[PDB]
Swiss-Prot record, chains A, B, C, D:
It catalyses: L-ribulose 5-phosphate = D-xylulose 5-phosphate. Binds 1 zinc ion per subunit. Also able to use cobalt and manganese ions, but less efficiently. InterPro entries: Aldolase_class_II_sugar_metab, Aldolase_II/adducin_N, Aldolase_II/adducin_N_sf, AraD, AraD_entero. Inhibited by glycolohydroxamate at concentration above 0.1 mM. The active site is at D120 (proton donor/acceptor). GO terms for biological process: L-arabinose catabolic process to xylulose 5-phosphate; L-lyxose metabolic process; pentose catabolic process. This is L-ribulose-5-phosphate 4-epimerase AraD.
Amino acid sequence: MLEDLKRQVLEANLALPKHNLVTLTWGNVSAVDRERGVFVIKPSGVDYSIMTADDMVVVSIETGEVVEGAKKPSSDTPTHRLLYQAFPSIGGIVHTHSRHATIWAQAGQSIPATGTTHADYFYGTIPCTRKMTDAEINGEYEWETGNVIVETFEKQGIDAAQMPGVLVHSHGPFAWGKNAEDAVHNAIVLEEVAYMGIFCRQLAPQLPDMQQTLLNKHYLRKH
Amino acid sequence: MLEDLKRQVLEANLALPKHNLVTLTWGNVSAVDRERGVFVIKPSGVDYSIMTADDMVVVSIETGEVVEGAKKPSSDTPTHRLLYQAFPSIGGIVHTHSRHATIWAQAGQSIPATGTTHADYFYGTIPCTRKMTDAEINGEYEWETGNVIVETFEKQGIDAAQMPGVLVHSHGPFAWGKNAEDAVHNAIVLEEVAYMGIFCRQLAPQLPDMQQTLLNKHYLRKH
Amino acid sequence: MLEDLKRQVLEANLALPKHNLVTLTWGNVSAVDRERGVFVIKPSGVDYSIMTADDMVVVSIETGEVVEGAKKPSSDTPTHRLLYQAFPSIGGIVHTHSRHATIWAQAGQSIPATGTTHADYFYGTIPCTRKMTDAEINGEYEWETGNVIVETFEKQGIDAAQMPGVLVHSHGPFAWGKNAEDAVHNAIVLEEVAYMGIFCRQLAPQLPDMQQTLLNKHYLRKH
Amino acid sequence: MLEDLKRQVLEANLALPKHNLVTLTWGNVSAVDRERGVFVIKPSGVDYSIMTADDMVVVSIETGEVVEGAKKPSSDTPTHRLLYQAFPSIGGIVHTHSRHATIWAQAGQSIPATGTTHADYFYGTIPCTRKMTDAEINGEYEWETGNVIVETFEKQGIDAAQMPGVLVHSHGPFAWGKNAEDAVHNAIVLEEVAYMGIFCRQLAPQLPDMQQTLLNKHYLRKH
Ligand SMILES: [Zn+2]
Ligand SMILES: [Zn+2]
Ligand SMILES: [Zn+2]
Ligand SMILES: [Zn+2]
């Protein structure tokens, strides 16, 4: 019912292993169609090497119910849905356990902006959420994961439109963008600055965050 | 005599270099057939690029004697055999010297669970064995290596069915699963969490193990 | 108007992703033609996988105006131009955000010469610039970036002909050479010594710079 | 005049980039023919992608003079020659600047045996030479590099037949074996244990060298 969207989401998902952001069947990408009040997401239980546009699943933003698709949607669907509802500006969402972004997530630390590479895509510190409560973990887990992300941005006054990424404590990264492709790009850059962030810290443990002026020059220039 | 099993084991072995879990001729995979009281394992002295299903060797679980095969079985056969005998639930075993899991093994330290990636495959700390005694090293080495692994799980009260992996002090990782393929997957994830475990420790040297609730949510959800 | 030069610059740019010096669309290479008072540089907004020799842009060294080309030149053109004007000897320039060189840049530290690998291409410490002032960042940024590089070499008395590389604080590496190809080679070696520099420091935090005699033997031997 | 040897040496050299032991034109492999009193080595100034068996150069062990070949021999020829003369048992030599072995070399530290991976190929600590004197550096450099290696093994009482590798302070690794292929294998394993050696140290800074019994079990088993 949204063949082109399914194609985009299919290609985005296929891009995950190509850019070494994932292994086995981890990761998932989705793209939204606000007008139709629905979003397309990777299916659960399908290898990337067999995946076809038909395997993509269409889900209702409002009810989280599957509108079209023979396969079961990704188990992360609730988190995606919550995010689309909470952040109006986003059009695509990417979830992976890319090694270095995940390393920061497991360490429960935020990735500070120390380079223009980072400044070009994330306006400031890429936030890491607080740990989830037992109530949250044992309740509607995936949906609750989404709430913890939204809470992180709200309590810290950060605009989801200027920070297309977040690290979920002890879990991994979540990125988003204008569309499926854009989200994938932010996901790869997120992994990139996560990697460089580890070693530049090692070289300079007391390195201060980059100059606000430089951060502004780069982020505001684009966007 | 077990053509399909030989095919599975052949493919599993071939997967080792594809996933960069090994170099040269290191590593070996085997799968069991309880009813026939036998297991199929990689041959010793054969490059992965020349290996064929016929090269796989069939070995008796009870006697450790070669039941069928023109080639010599992997020198690690005794360890595999011991493990099949000791852990009834396992159907496949993988041994590699994958860089990061091996780094932990040489450091003689256990990989703590600090992420959901880990929680999805290993129910808790991936154990590292104690050093082997000179008696053990100079006796039936490979067989004794198997005993040290079993002893590790017993003295620490860990269920082999919930912890499909172990690190042998100063040597390398050993993984297992329901079958050849499943064992290979656990082997690759083991390497993965080993890698992330190194750097998340660097970022947070005092990082506590992940929340028991989160560990439970993830491991118990599957399995 | 300089088909062969465009070919060289096209190939050089295409080499960036091949040698894993870049991702997405980052990076850019240019080569000069002193006699014609012009230089050819990568275009802005074109994927490496679609790039053709026609996409290359010809720019005036003196006016920085586009002499030929349907596409917009790289946003880094001003930095390139400034460098060609300031350093007469250079014939090619490469800019990338290659992970390890960039790690040093974000750490704001210079890469010391600790190996003959380094000695063969850089005569001494590969300099990292000071931070740029707000005036510089908010003025003609790219052009000013070039000035900060030149100032670095002048105040430190380093000959651009013996040090084909520099790290721009919080940004990334810039390399150059006799031509497009030569610059690319220096860029890859720069990344290489940046990588080894990180870990040899970890192994030996108090390691002194390599023997001046060894540095001289290697650099002076070639060049 | 030794077509088969030239083929072997050609393939060995070509293996260097395949196993990521080198970049650009670094590295070189040679194999000897004691009876003919000559050795075949990679040529200087030829890309790996263009190299053919004819490009290999034949050199006299006794005079170091080129016996056959249109191209100039590797600038490292003297070091190779010296080594063949000093160590009768070796039949092949490999020199590379493989990242991790080179990291140890630049740090001027020896790689301790902490794993069976290492034990299978190197009987003990892989030695790193002392720094070379100015007299040595400014004299017959390459030949002198060979002398420093031999001196290292002699003063430390280490048998070249049991330690197919060495690190030259501030330079890089040198490996050898029964033949070209065997030397290449030792070179790749040397890089491997160098890599793991870096991080297992990070995990366990006070980790003692592996048990002598385990080292013996593994090295003596083979060889
Ligand atoms: Zn996840
Ligand atoms: Zn082993
Ligand atoms: Zn840049
Ligand atoms: Zn060298």
